[model samples]
Target: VYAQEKQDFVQHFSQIVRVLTEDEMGHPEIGDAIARLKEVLEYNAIGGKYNRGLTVVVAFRELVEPRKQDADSLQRAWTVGWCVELLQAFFLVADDIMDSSLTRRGQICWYQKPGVGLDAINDANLLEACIYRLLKLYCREQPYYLNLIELFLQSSYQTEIGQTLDLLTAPQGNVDLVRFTEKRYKSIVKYKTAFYSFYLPIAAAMYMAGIDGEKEHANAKKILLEMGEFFQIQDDYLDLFGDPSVTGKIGTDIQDNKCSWLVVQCLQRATPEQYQILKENYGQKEAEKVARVKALYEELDLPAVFLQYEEDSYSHIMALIEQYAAPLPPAVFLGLARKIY
Candidate 1:
């Protein structure tokens, strides 16, 4: 977000708010409706690290030739970048509600904040609507307009299915270690996190930059989705081990009953007694129980295991980049890899 371009991306959000505000000014209560929608957009969309959205902008910059990267196209890139953020906001708002999360991006979750509650359901939907609104307003005439819409819709459904897989495994009160297998983890990551976060942005960048060949898009997805798996695994590692102050949100994968990487590795390595201990303490809502699981994770030396896995994943993705990324530049894939590693 410290990037001047990122700052420009941030500033452009108000234009989004203003455009939406101006569009529905004709009817009674429209002012209030638009105002609240504006609030929803700001609270959820503006607080993120913007990596996904920035990826669209950066990848667009790298993909398109300098002569063709006009002021108009750059603005479209920025607008489309914000569209991705809006999609992210929509997802985060819904996810927080589903996760029963307390905080996000260092602040109280939208659904948890006063009066938001389940109304955030509709608020989340509206955040999604903002994506289309901005697209039509700014990018409707562009050749990639329909492609962008199609890509976004497909990404959303893929993510929802991935989430369904995650929730099926990590059901709120039900802790079944047998379901948290390596195959299940990859399935969950591939659909739940990878398609949207890693693949969609670059795909959007690719489409926006006029490189719409199926071969290139499919090629990018393979590398990007694997990167998505590593990125999510890194996130799973951070949930318990990362500093909450630095992470800007407390992790709940253990207490919230997530099918996390640490738990999967722990399952693969645990002795009978250690497995027994995890069974008792794994998904309990109590603080002491979470403490017990954390201690068990450390006793198993999962932190060291994760560091090695992280290094392994880094090298693996690098090899993947060399092998898969072609027709499209490897730098685009490398950008996401560097961020994750």
Candidate 2:
């Protein structure tokens, strides 16, 4: 499978590092600065699962005619894939800062390090800047250069706009579930998580393959957005039901007063008495309080509700893949869908 070979995709990271320009690398002080940026890149960019990054490589291989995918084309494709990872790292570095996370990728988060504390904002911005620079380096002469640049910029804005939806809905001190409607939750997930995660990678591949038409991108977004929504919901499910060791992090959405899918669903199904209990138990930091909320979630059998949602979402994604992914090979979308469930 295209995504199975993650190491080959990751090895191309040197090409990312080599972006330090000739004159830029001349001065010793500049060299140190570049090295620090390199440190940020390695620490933040390389650690995640890399599915979104790999999606570009695989989709390009599948979408572009086999004849055109030669040595240089594949190399270029991999770097575009890495560019997607760069964008992800940029957002995550900033995300961890705002969330005030203690760790990420099983290490102390970039912003949490001693000297880097608040200044991690600059490092995050630098990581974001690297996306365009690398795209220019790799896709400059390609027909899709501006298309790629615009796609990335649009995706970033879409994600931040989604972040706005999130902050408005879940501002920390407000425990009112009045604003946490199912419709609002779906909107937040689509804007904040789905656009960049699902749509951008394959859309990048589409432009790279000269399939930059609106109808195709819209069709792809239809299916990918569904996949992205299911992914976020499943992630929400795991925040309560998932095993800590396997998930590699404690679930904090409940304690952190997040506007999660589970919280939204819980509001929908709760009665007046149950709603009062949730309001009391939610937004509390004590272990017993979090546990009380978790027990209440089970009292409503939310885990079962979540499992059923996953099953339905899996079927719907397959059906959408069949309906929308025409002209383009099904394998391109199929691979990503398989991994999401």
Q: Output the lDDT of residue 188, model 2.
A: 93
lDDT for each residue of candidate 2 in 234-328, tens digit (9 for 90 to 100)? 99889889999987867988888888888888888888998998889888899999899888888888899998988888889889989999978
Best by lDDT: 1
For each candidate, what TM-score against the reference?
Answer: 0.95, 0.96
Report the error of model 1 at residue 19, Å.
Answer: 1.2
Whole-model alpha-carbon lDDT for candidate 2: 0.88
Q: Candidate 2: deviation at residue 196, Å?
A: 0.4
lDDT of 2 at 95: 91
User: What lDDT score goes with residue 168 in model 2?
Assistant: 88
Candidate 2 total steric clashes: 0
| Model 1 lowest lDDT segment of ten | 1-10
